[PDB]
Amino acid sequence: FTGLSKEELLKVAGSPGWVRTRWALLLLFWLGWLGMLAGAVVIIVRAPRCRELPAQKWWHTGALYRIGDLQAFQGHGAGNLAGLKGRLDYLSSLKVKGLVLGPIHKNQKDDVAQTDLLQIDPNFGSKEDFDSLLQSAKKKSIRVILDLTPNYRGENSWFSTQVDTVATKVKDALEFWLQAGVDGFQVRDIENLKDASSFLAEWQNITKGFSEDRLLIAGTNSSDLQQILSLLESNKDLLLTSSYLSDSGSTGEHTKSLVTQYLNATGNRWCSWSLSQARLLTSFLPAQLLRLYQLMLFTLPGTPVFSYGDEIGLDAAALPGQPMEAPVMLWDESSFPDIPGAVSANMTVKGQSEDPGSLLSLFRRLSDQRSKERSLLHGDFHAFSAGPGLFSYIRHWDQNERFLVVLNFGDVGLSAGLQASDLPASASLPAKADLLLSTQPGREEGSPLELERLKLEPHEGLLLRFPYAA
């Protein structure tokens, strides 16, 4: 303790058989270190590797917002494009990575000579203002998609007269708007223009030849799968929105049947999941199913398309003297100068922003969850059978958080009865799963919930998550 003697200790430690002991211990330490290094190398080599990264474009990572007419979205007076500059922040709050801005080219009757899509209508605004809107959107990381439906006022939506002129005009305005700076195009009512497949293929070819980050959308009014599939034959990069999804309003398993059939026929490729081309949810559904469809469209494998007023649950039947196609946006209690009391406090964006049980809160949380999560971004989708009226599926990419969505379309409550028995063992759901949210309030959140005692009240949905399992 007080310090052992310096000299005798040094001289005693020289006897053969003990000086070699320290050499043996040092060699043992070094060989143990080498063995542990070799074991670490062996463990590193024998391990699964990262699969890949699909290198997705800009429209794969978020929703899309449709604004058919700026007059109703903004209000009376401020019908110009610059007004959207004051509202883009709101859209950036919704976390929408697109903006399908409606047609702006001049059109006032069924005429063809003086109605052209070369330059903007004078009443809408100015070219410099449109460029200002483009630069403001680019600063805000929002991509503006234009629309070039030649006729939208009359019933004849695509000039059922000779079609060479309109095709030439479209092909001439295309590169014009490309060098203008837009990031996509949309053409609606594709069933009116003759031999649509060849023209769509040509337009897709030119747009994709200009750049690798351009997008083209087509809109059709047919709910038949065969017609849609035949349209998507010649070209494959197309984004096609059709009214095929809805087809219902009193049936629950029909939606699952259509979704699975479409995914199987198209080859598990990229598709747009929308209820219609220029219509919102409340046109085809009652007020008791909006949250279910908002939860379904924000988890299916594709780019979801919503119209304006689809997050506050805007409905056109609840107000009188209101156009069905383009109702005004209920920003606040001052929606109309007259009838002060017909509107309610929960029909405005301000009254729904902070309400926990509002539609807008669910929309914001779902959009934020879809924008960032990789499994929801480009994860594989697998569906399994369930009870009489349950739609349940799994999103899983490689090793991230797996998501399990279960929706109840029935009018009465029933037990879940979850069972797959067919999915690959890689992403088998466990007996214990977490929770994210419920469409209708009255349940717990944030804590694990056992998957065998699951119950579902009528018109409900669950967004459980579970981590990667070995």
Partner 1 sequence: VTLQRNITLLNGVAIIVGTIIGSGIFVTPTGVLKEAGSPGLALVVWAACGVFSIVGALCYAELGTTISKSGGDYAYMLEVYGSLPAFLKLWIELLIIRPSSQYIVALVFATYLLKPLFPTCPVPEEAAKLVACLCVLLLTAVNCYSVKAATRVQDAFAAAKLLALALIILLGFVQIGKGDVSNLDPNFSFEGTKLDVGNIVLALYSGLFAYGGWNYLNFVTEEMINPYRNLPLAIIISLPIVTLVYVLTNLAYFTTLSTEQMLSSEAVAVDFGNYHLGVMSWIIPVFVGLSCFGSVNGSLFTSSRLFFVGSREGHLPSILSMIHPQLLTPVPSLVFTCVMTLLYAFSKDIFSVINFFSFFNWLCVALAIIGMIWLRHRKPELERPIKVNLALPVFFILACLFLIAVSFWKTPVECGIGFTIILSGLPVYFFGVWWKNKPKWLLQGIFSTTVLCQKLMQVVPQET
Ligand X SMILES: *[C@@H]1O[C@H](CO)[C@@H](O[C@@H]2O[C@H](CO)[C@@H](O)[C@H](O)[C@H]2NC(C)=O)[C@H](O)[C@H]1NC(C)=O
How far is 312 from 353, CA to CA, in rounded Å? 9
31 binds partner 1, rule: CB under 8 A = no
Q: Which of 156, 198, 344, 415 binds ligand X (CB under 6 A)?
A: 344
141 binds ligand X, rule: CB under 6 A = no
DSSP 59: G
Please choose which of ligand X, partner 1, none residue 208 contacts, taking the beta carbon within 5 to 8 angstroms, the exact cut-off set by kind.
ligand X
> Over 8-47, what HEC string results?
HHHHHCCCCCCHHHHHHHHHHHHHHHHHHHHHHHHHHHCC
447 binds ligand X, rule: CB under 6 A = no
For residue 260 the two structure tokens come to 């699975």
Residues 6+ apart with CB under 8 A from 40: none
How far is 192 from 165, CA to CA, in rounded Å? 15
156 binds ligand X, rule: CB under 6 A = no
In 3D space, the residue among 441, 433, 442 whose CA is nearest the CA of residue 464 turns out to be: 433
Please choose which of partner 1, ligand X, none residue 399 contacts, taking the beta carbon within 5 to 8 angstroms, the exact cut-off set by kind.
partner 1
End-to-end Cα spacing for the chain: 54
Q: Which of 27, 28, 31, 36 binds partner 1 (CB under 8 A)?
A: 36
Q: Toward partner 1, which CB reaches closer, 34 or 339?
A: 34
How far is 187 from 3, CA to CA, in rounded Å? 93
Task: Pick the stretch among 42-50, 69-77, 113-121, 332-340 that binds partner 1 (CB under 8 A).
Answer: 42-50
For helices 82-94 and 127-139, give the axis angle rounded to 10 degrees. 20
Please choose which of ligand X, partner 1, none residue 50 contacts, taking the beta carbon within 5 to 8 angstroms, the exact cut-off set by kind.
partner 1
How far is 357 from 86, CA to CA, in rounded Å? 28
424 binds partner 1, rule: CB under 8 A = no
Q: Toward ligand X, which CB reaches closer, 272 or 352?
A: 352
Tell me the per-residue interface mask from 190 to 229 with partner 1, x by CB under 8 A, - otherwise: ----------------------------------------
Q: Toward ligand X, which CB reaches closer, 212 or 444?
A: 212
Q: Helix or strand or coil: residue 281? A: helix
In 3D space, the residue among 229, 221, 166 whose CA is nearest the CA of residue 197 turns out to be: 229
* Shortest distance (Å) from residue 446 CB to ligand X: 26
Task: Pick the stretch among 6-14, 196-204, 348-356, 401-409 that binds partner 1 (CB under 8 A).
Answer: 6-14
Site for ligand X in 254-273 (CB under 6 A): 264
Do the bridges between strand 216-220 and strand 239-242 make them parallel or antiparallel, or are there none, so unpaired?
parallel
Residues 6+ apart with CB under 8 A from 23: none
Site for partner 1 in 359-418 (CB under 8 A): 372, 398-399
205 binds ligand X, rule: CB under 6 A = yes
Please choose which of partner 1, ligand X, none residue 48 contacts, taking the beta carbon within 5 to 8 angstroms, the exact cut-off set by kind.
partner 1
How far is 300 from 405, CA to CA, in rounded Å? 10
Residues that bind partner 1 (CB under 8 A): 1-4, 6, 9-10, 12-13, 18, 22, 33, 36-37, 39-40, 43-44, 47-51, 53, 141, 372, 398-399
| Chain contacts with ligand X (rule: CB under 6 A) | 205, 208-209, 264, 344, 346-347
